[PDB]
Amino acid sequence: ISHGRVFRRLGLGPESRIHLLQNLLTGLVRHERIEASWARVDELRGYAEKLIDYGKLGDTNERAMRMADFWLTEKDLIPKLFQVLAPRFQGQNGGYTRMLQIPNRNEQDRAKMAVIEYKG
Amino acid sequence: LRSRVTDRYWRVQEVLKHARHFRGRKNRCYRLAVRAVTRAFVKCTRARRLKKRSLRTLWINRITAASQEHGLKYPAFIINLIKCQVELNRKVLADLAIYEPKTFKSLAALAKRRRXXXXXXXX
């Protein structure tokens, strides 16, 4: 039953779900803003906040280091995340990963479109 | 060599012309129109035969009512009318039982008079 359950499915397996989150977060941290389905976005929010917080923990700390290496394989994302994106959010707490809605829909599945963006 | 020409189409057109106001395919399709037409005519004959029965029963009910208003029943009124040599139909008798209570009151008075005179002559 769906009673009291976060962590949705979205028609993907656990590995496929995790990999999807890693890819969407890759694009998110790379382009600073991305466009995806409302469900995937709303789900991506929390994980994004988590990765940001992990970046806020410490650079030298091993826990944060191996966590960041675990989720993000790309070597381009990590230094840009720690050195650039992290220090500007230092004062913020829940103030990152904003979600907005897109006016139109796809011509195929008419999927509701939403955009996720970090505060500049 | 002959042809089907307009004959069949005209017959169908006629049947469907008589099939108007019918419900569904019976006012559209030809076969169901015919099947409904036969039943319609049979019911025409039968209902025209039983119409007299329905009207007769209704008239009998009305006259029974008007009679019971005066204290006597329908059969007694009929008998009294028979012995009064009254050949008046129940239609006109019902019409009088509705529009002209005076005449029916007179007939009922004569009815009770004949009944009382017969009951007094028998004793």
């Binding site: 382009h31 809605q101 897109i102 006016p103 | -």
Partner: protein, 68 residues
């Protein structure tokens, strides 16, 4: 299983019209605070935003091509 008899027009109409309520019409229409164009409620405009998003995408591609 198989249908016993052919469906009448009345049943078909009453089934395909009334319960489904066709398409319920609410008001999604709102005027954009910027360009004044008519757009959907609780949603970003499709005029003054998509062009700025395409210009921001071209500026991000030009910056990524100039940095490389």
């Amino acid at each position: 299983a198989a249908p016993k008899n052919r469906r009448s027009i009345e049943v078909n109409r009453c089934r395909r019209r009334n319960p489904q309520k066709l398409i319920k019409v609410k008001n999604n229409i709102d005027v954009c605070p910027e360009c004044g164009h008519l757009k959907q409620k609780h949603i970003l405009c499709g005029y003054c935003x998509x062009x700025x998003x395409x210009x921001x995408x071209x500026x991000x591609x030009x910056x990524x091509x100039x940095x490389x």
